Ligand binder design. Structure first.
Ligand code: A1EC8
Ligand code: A1D7S
Ligand code: A1D7S
Lengths: 642, 642
């Protein structure tokens, strides 16, 4: 007996809306015959076929297919001994017909010599175009013909065809039925055809009519016609009551990316462009700021000329052009106005960032202030000071202008004394800053954000790749077709991890080369542990794509959940601002987030050179390991009940 | 004479590898009969039906349906004079059956009173569940029946049914065919039914067999059988040789998103949550910074207690506990260590950010330095100074620590004199900063990024909503089904712009309220023009969704195209860092980007209170207007050659 289903029962949904898809179903399929299964809808037959192949399980009843229970190692129901043609075209695009044949033959263990003979025979028999034509370039009928040829290549002892000829040319239909008759006759082969056609399954040696989840009758066609006395079948029906699989899967995964230029540009040319733009735009010091200078010790000539001239040695000739000489040249441009009212007006518009206004007696009052110290009259204290009106609406620019205007006075003051043979240490505030313990006196903001950009690119470009791949592959029956072919779920998962591991290693090479070698972001720590931490974040990101793909069933719902969690964690992990800004209550919560302790750990490796032994460094390695385990437990728990 | 087709030549390709989908094709449909079209594949017949309806145009020949050419004057072919049932289920999910019938009835202009009678009749006739059940909750065999009911409800004079009986129970197929032969009984009605199943189109009055893009024979079924002598048709086919339509579309647009809890949360609850997290974590000043104080003038008791006391009046008792009282209590936490080389070990680890180290001779050396002047010996200048070893690996924390330590010395110095009846102005550097022209002396970074975050949320929440809505509709056949109902593309586009405009107004109100009324972000300028500019950036975002949806056809390629331009534009529009830091060549390129000049214009209206008359303000209005027109032009050119 090819198949024996006895007292099959099946339920769907919850108790609120029970669905008795199968109820007390009996079925028998002998060896060497064709068994047509004609049903009204398209659900009971598909559910029965899924129970036969082993995908589903019966609530009550018994099944004996090919010798033993489906998928129990007592028989080879999922494997080379069965031939499956799904209702949908569960084929791979971007695959030539020859490549599809090779992939499935390797999955079935066929040698490459016989695959070519079978391919040539099937191409000659099924009226198909050249083997090199990609499947995505074919029409619906040719795609269905290729899907039918896939189920015939390994010569199984049980064929399960789901509407094999729905719109096939009538001559081709006749040839197909003749071939099925030839292979099934006087042999061990069996065919089980499921169709909505009532009038095509006349050549089936036994017909089973489905209704209300049970077989109304099951007899030979002409026997049914004679016994019920009807001219055609419709009148009778019109009654009022293991390394070869992994190698095959590895060459499929990499070839599914090479034929998508959009995918390669998104996961290999976007990080390179993102890193280039970040290192050129973020963190650098502003370097074009303009200042309106009103020097009343010199005559006004132009808005771009002042003839600031003085004597370098001594005698303190001007001291207003001498201060402006020490001003830093890279970030401040000098503009000249003849009136403090005319210079403040420029600031009130977008023509300057500040005003200076040296008074006409700046020199005399400044010398009389240093010489007569600790008892200077209020008149001197008012005529010897520079009056700066600043535009402090921008925080970072206001910081630079205040820093560069007070720092230039220190150099100016260290030049006045020292040119008259005095020590320059007399012009220093008692608060003296010694050599920094870490870093330097001129830090950069792009060194603070660089650790956060590296981890965010790797983490969230693996959530996108895994969720998209495992969802579009599951929705078109590609996973269910290869499961019947004999590919265990462990082998499906192993190949995805290896493929994703290699991809994330290429991204790590590109991101770290451009950040460090080209744009000169310092790495004072161990380069070996930076590579390990970046990769561990990629695996943690990949494990989050398992959660998303186990919850969401549509692409549009997965991207909302991926983007709905990428934004909040970016603003709480301290990538673009120090973690010390948040309140104490909000600082506790942010620590437990996936990327918070990993960004802190990477920032200490690069900016301070700390090793793995430091508590602040290995806390970012233990935090990723916990989240890898947590993301796997949640994903496994979701699949348990759903 | 309903449909006449003469010499209908239609071809697909680019004149290099042409596909002849149609050839010399003559076809006449007599009024008052049932016509079956029984081709093999599913593309030639579908192409012919699309030409008949009016969707497409031919290359040669004439098409004459119901009086005149389709889609032109002289006929009502696209409208209420035809009834179209597509090959795919083109129904709306999240719609009850009653709501679907009301929607399609309003499209055809029938009164809501007589829609009920048709609904009840069709419900009873087609054996369907209660009208309150959602379409998505129906099975696959009931959605086809609902589609058939939709195609039959307004009582047209020409029914074009595309395989209405795929998985229908025979007891219902008989009733459907009886209804079909009953309505078209010596009347004005015609049915054009196209099937792959030859045996079921026997009841049709006329049959046209299609092959290779032409009709092999077109005669009565019994005449076809008799003239060739065959018993069934299978052997014979073996031939080796406006208001009301806009109102209806607005209800459907506002009900599609109200019935999707995921969509409501993404576009209404995520912008609110994003604004809260940004205003609580980004831009604020660090607060818990710890310092390691070494004070050799006092005894050492604990790591948290030092018993610092002095005399407030005069005589300068300790002057090292006096300076520490002026330290800012908010940002600096004081810790005490016994040795100068022991507190540096705390900084080397993560237990502090700096060290202070007041010497044991600090009080006597400081009072002997300020009381001497310019003649202090080098020994005194070394014993009267505080030595700070800072951790400058963090740029932002390094600024606060240096600013607070230098500022506290000014308040300390301004307190020494003033308590001894001296002029406090004596303790000032000549560089004196007057009152800022714009802003205050303590600017906030979150005020710099807030104007850039408002525009980014609104712009990219419209690219997401517009691209997804217009891609799901087109790929599911819903756009084409309503076009045959008479809904002009002008009314589809007008009702979409209205739907998005109302949504972007609600988003603007939520973002502006949670930013200004709560969290107190300053708004100096006019609030009337802040709302206008924010909405104008929303319309530019929607127009970018037209370009994406007209270029991409799959869901996943629009996601990558949208994200592939979101990230590069964020790093070039000066949202998170001043645009003055970028190199000059990159600065010129960035000003032409969609969001650059708009962010600058909104920042000036918020932080300085500038009006529309300032060039820096209305340049952001001009750039948004120009990019709106450019985006609309690009979408039209793409739709021309595609
Ligand atoms: C995917 C996961 C990750 C993707 C790869 C990640 C690349 C690597 C990481 C890059 C980081 C490096 C530099 C970061 C520094 C940036 C500073 C910042 O972070 N700024 C902050 C603040 O400070 C920033 O301004 C605030 C920002 C957020 C703004 C909101 C934008 C939301 C939309 C984004 C674009 C559209 C995407 C299309 C999805 C369509 N969806 C839908 C489908 C179907 C339906 N339907 O069914 O209709 C829909 N309905 O609605 N939507 C529907
Ligand atoms: C970085 C990691 C951070 C944290 C780690 C982890 C925590 C654990 C993972 C936790 C995720 C949590 C809950 C997911 C649950 C259940 C979804 C699956 C059930 C059904 O929800 C349907 C589809 C999917 O159902 P689907 O199969 O596709 O539809 C049927 C198709 N025929 O869900 C969707 O769209 C969700 C769309 C998310 C919108 C993103 C913006 C969110 C803004 C803030 C949200 C505010 C919440 C307020 C609560 C209001 C309650 C009414
Ligand atoms: C904010 C404003 C920004 C800029 C202002 C703009 C002015 C113009 C905007 C122009 C953008 C438009 C069209 C671009 C062109 C053409 C795409 C559509 C044609 C055909 O591409 C097929 C499908 C579409 O076909 P599909 O529907 O998916 O398949 C159907 C199968 N039958 O496109 C896709 O793969 C989208 C996947 C995008 C990948 C993102 C990568 C981001 C980093 C790129 C790095 C540098 C790239 C260098 C180019 C090298 C070329 C080898």
């Amino acid at each position: 007996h090819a198949v024996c289903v006895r007292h099959a029962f099946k339920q769907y949904g919850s108790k609120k809306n029970p669905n008795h898809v199968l109820s007390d179903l009996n079925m028998t399929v002998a060896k060497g015959t064709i068994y047509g299964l004609l049903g009204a809808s398209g659900c009971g037959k598909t559910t029965l076929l899924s129970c036969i192949v082993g995908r589903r399980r019966l609530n009550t009843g018994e099944i004996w297919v090919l010798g033993g229970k489906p998928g129990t190692k007592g028989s080879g129901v999922p494997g080379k001994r069965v031939g499956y043609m799904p209702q949908e075209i569960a084929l791979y695009g971007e695959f030539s017909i020859k490549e599809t044949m090779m992939y499935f033959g390797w999955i079935f263990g066929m040698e490459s010599s016989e695959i070519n003979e079978r391919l040539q025979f099937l191409l000659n028999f099924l009226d198909l175009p050249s083997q090199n034509r990609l499947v995505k370039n074919l029409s619906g009928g040719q795609q269905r013909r290729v899907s039918f040829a896939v189920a015939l290549m390994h010569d199984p002892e049980l064929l399960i065809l789901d509407e094999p000829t729905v719109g096939v040319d009538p001559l081709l239909r006749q040839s197909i039925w003749n071939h099925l008759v030839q292979i099934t006759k006087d042999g061990n082969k069996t065919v089980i055809i499921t169709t909505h056609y009532i009038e095509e399954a006349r050549q089936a040696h036994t017909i089973g009519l489905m209704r209300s989840g049970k077989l109304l009758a099951e007899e030979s066609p002409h026997v049914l016609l004679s016994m019920y006395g009807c001219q055609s079948l419709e009148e009778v029906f019109l009654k009022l009551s293991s390394w070869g699989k992994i190698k095959a899967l590895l060459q499929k995964n990499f070839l599914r990316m090479w034929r998508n230029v959009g995918v390669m540009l998104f996961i290999f040319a976007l990080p390179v462009m993102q890193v280039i733009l970040f290192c050129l735009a973020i963190g650098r010091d502003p370097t074009g700021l303009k200042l309106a200078i009103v020097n009343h010790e010199k005559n006004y000539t132009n808005q771009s000329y002042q003839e600031c001239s003085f004597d370098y040695g001594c005698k303190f000739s001007y001291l207003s052009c001498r201060y402006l000489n020490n001003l830093r040249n890279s970030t401040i441009l000098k503009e000249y106005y003849p009136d403090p009212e005319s210079a403040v007006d420029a600031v009130k518009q977008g023509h300057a960032w500040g005003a200076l206004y040296f008074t006409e007696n700046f020199t005399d009052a400044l010398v009389a202030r240093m010489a007569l110290g600790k008892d200077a009259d209020p008149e001197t204290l008012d005529q010897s000071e520079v009056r700066v009106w600043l535009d402090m609406s921008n925080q970072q620019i206001g910081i630079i202008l205040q820093r560069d205007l007070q720092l230039s006075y220190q150099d100016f003051a260290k030049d006045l004394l020292g040119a008259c043979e005095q020590n320059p240490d007399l012009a220093e505030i008692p608060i003296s800053f010694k050599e920094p313990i870490y870093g330097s006196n001129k830090p950069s903001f792009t060194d603070f954000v660089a650790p956060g950009v590296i981890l965010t690119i790797v983490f969230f470009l693996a959530v996108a790749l895994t969720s998209s791949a495992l969802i579009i592959e599951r929705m078109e029956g590609l996973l269910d077709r290869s499961w019947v072919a004999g590919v265990t779920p462990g082998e499906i998962l192993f190949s995805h991890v290896v493929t994703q591991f290699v991809v994330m290693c290429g991204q790590t090479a590109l991101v770290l080369i451009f950040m460090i070698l080209v744009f000169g972001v310092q790495c004072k720590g161990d380069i070996g542990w930076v590579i390990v931490l970046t990769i561990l974040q990629g695996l943690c990101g990949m494990c989050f794509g398992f959660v998303i793909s186990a919850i969401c069933e549509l692409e549009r719902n997965a991207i909302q959940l991926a983007l709905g969690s990428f934004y909040p964690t970016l603003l709480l992990s301290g990538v673009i601002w120090p973690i010390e800004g948040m309140p104490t209550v909000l600082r506790y919560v942010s620590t437990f987030l996936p990327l918070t302790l990993a960004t802190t750990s990477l920032r200490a490796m690069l900016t301070r050179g700390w090793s793995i032994a430091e508590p602040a460094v290995y806390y970012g390695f233990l935090a990723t390991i916990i989240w890898i385990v947590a993301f796997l437990t949640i994903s496994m728990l979701v699949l348990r009940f759903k």
